[PDB]
Each structure stands twice: as structure tokens, then as C-alpha cells.
Amino acid sequence: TTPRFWSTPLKYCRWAARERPALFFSVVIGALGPVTLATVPPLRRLIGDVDAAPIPLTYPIPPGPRKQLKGYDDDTE
Amino acid sequence: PQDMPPPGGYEAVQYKRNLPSRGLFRPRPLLAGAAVLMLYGWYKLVKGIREQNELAREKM
């Protein structure tokens, strides 16, 4: 009566959607996460939705030698 | 006299199962509705957490 996945793959999927809905659509939703990772991000870069730069979580020290400032000295105090 | 029925008889009463299907509880209109609510909410969330992240850049 109830089908067999490896004999009739499409026919099992209809029975499982109808007869085991919570179980079937659990595996469906779980697969959508792997799909959404694969699909939206490239399409986002196609439409020009650039990912935001990361926010600073430490003091942003610039690279290179020190600039040799002149100003705001003890005499100015 | 006695307690007798009206001359022409009483009219028929409703006795069969009535139970009429309403659109409010059919699955197709509800499935469509729940879906549009989650899609509108997911558009509103994707805008808010973007703004929240930008407010955090200013705070830092």
C-alpha cells in the first residue's frame, strides 16, 4: 500500500506530504536552509546588494609610521 | 376541543445536517494569508536589523 522511496521516488514524496506532513516538511524546511545559503547570496551580489562593512569592535589603529604631529604642546596649555 | 394540529399541518422543521463550509476556515485562503504575513514581516525585519547595525557603527 504505502510506497517505497527507492522504487518510486516521486510517488513516495506525495504520500509523505499527505500522510506524514510534519515529518516530510521538516526535511523540506531543513533543506531550504542549505538552498537559501547557496542561492540568495549570489543573486544579492547580482542586484548590487553589497554586504555592509563590519562594525569596529576594537580601537581602529591606522597602519604605517607615526605622523610626527606638531600642535597642542605644553607651551600652548 | 382538544389540542389538535393546525388545519393545514405544521410546516417542516430543519432536521438534516446543515454544517456549511465557510471560506474563513478553508486551507487555501489561510495558507495564502499566513504566507503574506511572514513575507511582509521578513521584509520589515530585514530593514530593521540593517538600520540597527548602522546605529551600532555610529555608537562605536
Which residue range(s) make up the domain with A30?
Answer: 1-77
User: Looking at this protein, which amino acid is placed at residue B60?
Assistant: M
| B-chain residues near A52 (CB < 8 A) | 50, 53-54
Q: Resolution in angstroms for this experimental structure?
A: 2.8
Q: Which alpha helices (H) appear in B1-60, and where do they start and end?
A: 27-59
For residue A64, with 0-12 CB atoms within 10 Å meaning exposed, 13-18 middle and 19 or more buried, which class applies? exposed
The experimental technique used to determine this model is cryo-EM
The x, y and z cell numbers of residue A42, run together, are: 549570489
Chain A: closest CA distance from residue B60 (Å): 7
CA separation for the pair B51, B44 (Å, rounded): 11
Q: How far apart are the first and last CA of chain B?
A: 98
- Give chain A's domain count: 1
Binary contact (B60, A52; C-beta < 8 A): no
